[PDB]
Amino acid sequence: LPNYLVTLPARLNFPSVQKVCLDLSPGYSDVKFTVTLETKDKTQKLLEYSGLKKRHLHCISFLVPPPAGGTEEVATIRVSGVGNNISFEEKKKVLIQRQGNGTFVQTDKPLYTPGQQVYFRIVTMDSNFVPVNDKYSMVELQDPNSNRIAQWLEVVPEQGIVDLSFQLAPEAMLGTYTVAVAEGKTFGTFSVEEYVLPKFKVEVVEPKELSTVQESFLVKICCRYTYGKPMLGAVQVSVCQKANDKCRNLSGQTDKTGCFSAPVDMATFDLIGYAYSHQINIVATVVEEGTGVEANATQNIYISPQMGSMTFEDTSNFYHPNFPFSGKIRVRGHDDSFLKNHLVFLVIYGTNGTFNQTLVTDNNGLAPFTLETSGWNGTDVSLEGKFQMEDLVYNPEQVPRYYQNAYLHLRPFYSTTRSFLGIHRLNGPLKCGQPQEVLVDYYIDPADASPDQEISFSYYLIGKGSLVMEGQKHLNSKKKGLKASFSLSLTFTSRLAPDPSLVIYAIFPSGGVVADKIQFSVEMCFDNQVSLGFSPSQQLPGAEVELQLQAAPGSLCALRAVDESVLLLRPDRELSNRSVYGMFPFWYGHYPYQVAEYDQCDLFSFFRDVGLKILSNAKIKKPVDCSRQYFPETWLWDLFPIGNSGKEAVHVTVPDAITEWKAMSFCTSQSRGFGLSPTVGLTAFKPFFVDLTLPYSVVRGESFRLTATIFNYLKDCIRVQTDLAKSHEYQLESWADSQTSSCLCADDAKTHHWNITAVKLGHINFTISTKILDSNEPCGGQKGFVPQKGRSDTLIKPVLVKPEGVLVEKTHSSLLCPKGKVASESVSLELPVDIVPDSTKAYVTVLGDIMGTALQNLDGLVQMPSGCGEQNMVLFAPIIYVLQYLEKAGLLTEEIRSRAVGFLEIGYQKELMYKHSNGSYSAFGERDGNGNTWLTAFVTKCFGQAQKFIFIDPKNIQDALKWMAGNQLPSGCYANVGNLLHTAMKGGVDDEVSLTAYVTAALLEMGKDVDDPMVSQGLRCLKNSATSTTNLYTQALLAYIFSLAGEMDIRNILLKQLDQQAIISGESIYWSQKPWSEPAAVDVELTAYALLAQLTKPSLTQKEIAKATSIVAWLAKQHNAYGGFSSTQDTVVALQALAKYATTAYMPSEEINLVVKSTENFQRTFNIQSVNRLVFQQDTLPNVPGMYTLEASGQGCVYVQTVLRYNILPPTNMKTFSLSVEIGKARCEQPTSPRSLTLTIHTSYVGSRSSSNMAIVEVKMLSGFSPMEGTNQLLLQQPLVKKVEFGTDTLNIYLDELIKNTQTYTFTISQSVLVTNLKPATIKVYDYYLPDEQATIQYSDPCE
């Protein structure tokens, strides 16, 4: 009786092909054997064949049918042998699926400080590691506040991968940002928080996890710097053990190596019983002498058992009856440590008997074993292998040690053949690509076999589910019963699994089967063979290195070169050729996959675990089983398309560090596949490391200490040689060795000192010059070693030498507007008699139009510290208004578009921290409960008009309108929660009509229609007070809300109201609440409201423009300094007005000829073209400040400004704010290096109003001083302080409402650099929205 075999793969994946195989016995030869599959949509023939006179094995590849009715479905594979009126038919239910393509997100770091650009890559792969070029529809980047802040649409992948960039804000939120891919199918999370660790790290080396067989131990508490340097200090070490707390404390001092050894004995703690905790903690507190700071180290040690657990990792699920089965057992203790000469007990349970036997192990922990199944006689048996007779002990009060017995159950190799085929496994991990040689012996039983035929072995090499290789070996069966062996040749790729299989079966044409499979263990390899090599991988920081990258031809690769501690932070979250695996292989265990068809619930028991869809006609019918250091910037993050040669050599420059760089790469190719490289290291080694401690802030005429500490790194004695370049910008006194070389040996430090005084101003560079020289004298009994590289170092560090006194700026903006004629203007700028010498500068700015001064200074505008929600919008909202001007006039080029939108997500990220859990936007954020409704209207207006430029989430605008629904009165008007606004035009108590006007005008400007219900409801509120209003700011804003809509009959009424209170200041008219050009604050924004109400007529009127250019002629001369309109809200309202005027009165501006003239016969020419209208034209005036002459000719309306800055010994005010300070503590006889002196500041508002709007007290620091560490917390603990900010030389403290009462704020400062002859330092308090109401005093130090 001849027999046949049909084999198909189990899972039928869509984008690739599979393989079908047919095995036919000698005999038949007239019977057509065919395989075909039937689906619900189509049917194709897989294979037709006819029998031969020999044993044949035919295998062909086939493409799967497309899936229908979803992704997962079940087809029917159908085998027919037809002939001699005999039909062998079957029907087997087989599963066909569209598999899930694997994908991952690779970020640049798992941890970023704020202010760094995040880079990431998105990679999609199939199950065979070929890249997928399916287009990503929409990808997003979200904050820790679950709010999307970036979004890319319709992004295409380049060879399956795509890279993206996102610049974070300098003030960014803290938490895990999330990159979401394809509506949230893929998440990549990276943490962003600000970590700076200047404290020296205290570590251990020899303390590790301990066992119970330890009676004594040595603890090496070693305290070292972040770059790595020992110091001398006293260490107290508490080694404690908790209770379900036996502790011992010791004290010592570290040596010159910095590692202190202490004997810790286990007998002082709980070691036998488990009534106490199983974890022992070491707390080391280090106090350095002369510092007083305490460094804390916590190290936990868990008590580990001596032995681990046994699992039958390499054990077959069957047994050969009446014939021996051999194998090996790997024995190891705890955490995969091999135990030499360990003892293993194995017991069999069955009907024959529960026999026990014992085995000894070798030094490698691999013990061979043989088992004889002569007496079992086809019965179900159980295997139990353990270490000893001891088992698990259960106790609710004590945590037991982990133990797991090696238990298995075996069921009866179901056949009619008693021949034997050998089992030959080869070691642990295997290699890929090399032809592996394996030998497997066999045996032939003469009773069930005939010597006339020839023997044949058919083997299937199966990996990643489907069968990969096949083959046949025909040998002579005339030798009959012997222990012969046959050879095999094996090629392994990534198509083979990490745990693939090889099955051999021999089948006789007279009758009988014998089968055996071997499970392998291959290292997770790839079709793409990549190599990330370095030259020379020991390079000095500063010189370029050669990176060689090898892959398959036609590949796209991606580098990630970063610090080693970035890899040491997270053991996971990197590509380590296990992360790219894992999601794919889960086909183990169960033979069907959502298929209810079974055979007897053996060949079925063989092909249950790793096998295929296999059917035959042999004996198969039997019931069987059916179941910690810093994180610097990253070195490389680049993309590289490599050529057909497969090599890519790139010269890349190392960063200036002392650390060791690690690089990781992956390569993607459509022809071959994916390839991942291990992390290959490059050490950046420098011989000597210097550290220049230098004060940022210093006043001229002071002195400070220049410091040039050199820390050795080589393990010998070197001769350093420090130098300072002599310059005329500073004078010096040599406290150092004065160009004398020293003997610095290994792990030894030296400190130099210089006394530096300053005679100039500005940024002054200090240049160090250190060099190991060729010594003529031996140091420490040995010759001074000269390294061949890194022999020199030239570090340059700057100082900011600010002048004494306070900076007073003076501006005189002009609006020469030539209507075909010559327009002239004189500028009068004068200096006081008490100016600080050589501190005066003057500069004239010429531009071709308006809305280009804001365009140059889109960042900034105000000179004020933007740390609140009402003031952040000078870096967000005039960008929207100037680009509305450039979009409605068609002058928006692409480069200013890209710069402005980059500033826009910077302002978006900075604004989004003032959002709440609700939709409202307060000023300071997360401390005010419910936010301000007016600022919510302002941010809703500038989010509605910015979503056509950048990506704004519509969810936060929708929550803003939900908060508008929450603040809608039944009278039709708009209310507010809390008392925190701008100047409020009189100090207004009601403010309801102006608030409702601004909310509804913001809704109309953002894009809502008149027939909108909130807009119509606010307008129905304002018909009540449409005419009867008195405040000029409220009248101009009310003329804006009635001029945005089409209520012209009362817009003309309000215009006639505004013509009564319009101050006719010559040819320029304007409006003011309380009636050289020094600007005021609220009159600028209310005449901006008047100008905005003028220019919102849809019908152009020539009489309207004649009044409008007079209002512009007043409004554009109030430009304070570089940005304009001194405060923040004044600036955004007046730039909105001037942008609306510039849209509604747009000019061609072909050419303007302008002459700047002065009294020193200094004249210069500016020429304005059409394209040259948006350049910030600048000239520093060399004249002594007096009068200047400005004339313009041509067609257009240009803007000219002149800014004068000088320094003044600051006079007091004593009429708006009363300000005083005094200095306590300060020692003056025991100064040391932390000269901690306190400052107590008494503030009050003695002005005319009931309360100031919002105040900034600006402690400009003394030279070389810092505000200690805890002053931020103890200033937030004091009342009426919302935010304290120390940028680089000033402490700005933000006050909510400063009043008639006197508030005392105290804070202590400590210097970092020693300073001598301290100049006085200023303290200034101003109203934020009225900066001219300021009070400036000065303080000093009573010692020097």
Author numbering: 20 to 263, 277 to 633, 670 to 695, 730 to 1177, 1186 to 1454
Sentences from the paper on this structure:
Human alpha-2 macroglobulin-like 1 (A2ML1) is a monomeric member of the A2M superfamily (A2MF) of protease inhibitors and complement factors. The functional inhibitory unit of A2ML1 is a monomer that depends on covalent binding of the protease (mediated by A2ML1’s thioester) to achieve inhibition. A2MF protease inhibitors utilize a unique trapping mechanism that pseudo-inhibits proteases regardless of their catalytic class. Trapped proteases remain catalytically active but are prevented from cleaving protein substrates through steric hindrance imposed by the inhibitor following a proteolytically triggered conformational change.
Structures of native A2ML1 were determined by X-ray crystallography and cryo-EM at resolutions of 4.4 and 3.1 Å, respectively. Overall, the cryo-EM and X-ray structures are very similar with an overall root mean square deviation (RMSD) of 2.0 Å for the entire molecule. Native A2ML1 is organized in two structural units connected by the MG7 domain. The N-terminal residues Glu19-Phe787 constitute the MG-ring formed by MG domains 1–6, the associated LNK region, and the bait region. The C-terminal domains CUB, TE, and MG8 encompassing residues His904-Glu1454 form a compact structure with extensive CUB-TE and TE-MG8 interactions, which we call the CTM8 body. In both the EM and the X-ray structures of native A2ML1, it is not possible to model residues His696-Asp726, suggesting substantial flexibility of the intact bait region in accordance with its accessibility toward proteases. However, in both structures, it is evident that the strictly conserved residues Arg730-Pro734 pass through the same narrow opening that houses the Nt-α′ in complement A2MF proteins. In particular, Tyr732 and Phe733 in the BR-C region form a hydrophobic plug inserted between the highly conserved Leu130, Leu216, and Val598. In native A2ML1, the bait region is threaded through a hydrophobic channel, suggesting that disruption of this arrangement by bait region cleavage triggers the extensive conformational changes that result in protease inhibition.
